[PDB]
């Protein structure tokens, strides 16, 4: 389909076990915002379009409603046929180019991602590194798996080392990127 | 075991919203079996497993669907995106750098990094004493960073020689074109 | 301005 411009509006999925749901918008490809359903939020991805424009959470839960109800039926119609795991397949880059001294960010994507869940967790020097990290929700692709993108916002120096660490459980052992400048 | 339900709500726009087609889907794990989309007018089994479901969307829902061509697609373009997502304008940054170390008569690769920017409209050519490079001028894709920025690199392969390379930039962020250069 | 979702529909089982 050939367009201008996509706009996603009422993306939601639905897994079972776990009761994990999520509802997207997107446009263009990029994350317009998430509804946080455990706090009933709207979450913005860009906060000034959020200032602007209101999304009434409430139509978030609503089509979560439906897709659990949704999920229950083709379980069953389907005579609980599973989901297959994909292995994800990740790749580390930096957001402007890496000058030892100034802040950067490392993004690591990760895509092939099917079912929406996933652990990508990042190292420096081997070791586990938290503050500031943030990623993405779960991106929808055309072939119905996810991508995911996850930040660490950090300074070059030639005496650190990272790694984007991906858990999953169509990978036998944890998937490992390096990236060093 | 692990089980999966998506639901996906696409509307496609051409020239603003004079043109507007919407699809929905439902997909069991991977397998979209029910689709609605405006071209065809009404829902219809994609697999399957969505054989008896059609029928009864169709009977139930169908004129809300349609609806929502505009009370969804139309509306959250014209009063939503127009003044956020369609009015974003990042400017690129630009800068060059050198593949290899630079050698006298040895091959090497102009790195043009173009980042930043949004929307994904740009233009990137190679100049070498004023003259465009055709040949010999490769780029990545475009690379969406996940923040509303995509970045792109152009090389350039070229072997320094005694002279002034330059990476110019177009984007609709910009007045004017950035240019920057480098000297063998 | 508010933006609307596109609605998913209850299968009848
Ligand atoms: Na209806
Ligand atoms: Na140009």
Redesign the interface.
């Given at each position: 389909?050939?367009?201008?411009?996509?706009?996603?509006?009422?993306?939601?999925?639905?897994?079972?076990?776990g009761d994990i749901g999520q509802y997207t918008h997107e446009?263009?490809?990029?994350?317009?915002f998430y509804v946080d359903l455990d706090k009933k939020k709207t979450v913005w991805?860009?906060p000034?379009?959020g200032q602007?424009?209101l999304f009434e959470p409430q139509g978030g839960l609503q089509?979560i409603a439906?897709?659990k109800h949704?999920?229950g039926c083709?379980?069953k119609?389907?005579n609980?046929?599973?989901?297959?795991?994909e292995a994800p397949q990740a790749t580390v880059?930096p957001?402007?180019?890496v000058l030892l001294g100034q802040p950067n960010t490392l993004?690591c994507?990760v895509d092939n991602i099917?079912?929406?869940?996933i652990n990508i967790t990042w190292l420096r020097n081997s070791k586990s590194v938290t503050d500031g990290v943030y990623e993405?929700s779960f991106?929808?692709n055309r072939?119905?798996?996810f991508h995911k993108?996850s930040?660490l916002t950090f300074i070059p120096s030639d005496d650190d080392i990272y790694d984007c660490k991906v858990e999953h459980?169509g990978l036998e052992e944890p998937v490992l990127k390096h990236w060093e400048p | 075991?692990?089980?999966?339900?998506?639901?996906?709500?696409?509307?496609?726009?051409?020239?603003?919203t004079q043109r507007i087609?919407?699809?929905?889907r439902?997909?069991?794990?991977?397998?979209?079996?029910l689709r609605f989309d405006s071209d065809v007018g009404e829902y219809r089994a994609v697999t399957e497993?969505g054989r008896?479901?059609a029928e009864?969307?169709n009977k139930?829902?169908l004129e809300?669907?349609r609806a929502?061509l505009d009370?969804?697609?139309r509306?959250?373009?014209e009063?939503?995106?127009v003044?956020?997502?369609?009015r974003?304008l990042e400017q690129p940054?630009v800068?060059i750098?050198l593949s290899r170390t630079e050698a006298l008569n040895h091959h090497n690769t102009l790195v043009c990094?173009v980042?930043?920017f949004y929307?994904?409209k740009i233009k990137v050519r190679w100049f070498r004493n004023g003259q465009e490079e055709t040949v010999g001028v490769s780029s990545t894709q475009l690379?969406?960073?996940?923040?509303?920025?995509f970045?792109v690199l152009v090389m350039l392969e070229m072997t320094p020689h005694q002279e002034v390379y330059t990476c110019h930039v177009e984007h609709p962020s910009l007045k004017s074109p950035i240019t920057v250069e480098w000297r063998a | 301005?508010?933006?609307?979702?596109?609605?998913?529909?209850d299968?009848?089982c």
């Open positions: 389909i050939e367009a201008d411009h996509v706009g996603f509006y009422g993306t939601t999925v639905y897994q079972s076990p446009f263009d490809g990029d994350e317009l991805r860009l000034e379009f602007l424009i089509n439906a897709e949704n999920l083709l379980t119609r389907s609980f046929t599973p989901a297959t795991n880059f957001k402007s180019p993004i994507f099917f079912p929406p869940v993405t991106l929808v072939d119905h798996s993108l930040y459980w | 075991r692990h089980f999966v339900h998506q639901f996906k709500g696409e509307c496609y726009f051409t020239n603003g087609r919407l699809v929905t439902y997909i069991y794990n991977r397998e979209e079996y497993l008896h479901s009864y969307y139930q829902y809300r669907t929502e009370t969804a697609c509306h959250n373009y009063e939503t995106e003044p956020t997502s369609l974003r940054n800068a750098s990094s980042t930043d929307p994904a690379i969406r960073n996940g923040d509303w920025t970045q | 301005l508010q933006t609307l979702a596109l609605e998913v529909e299968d009848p």
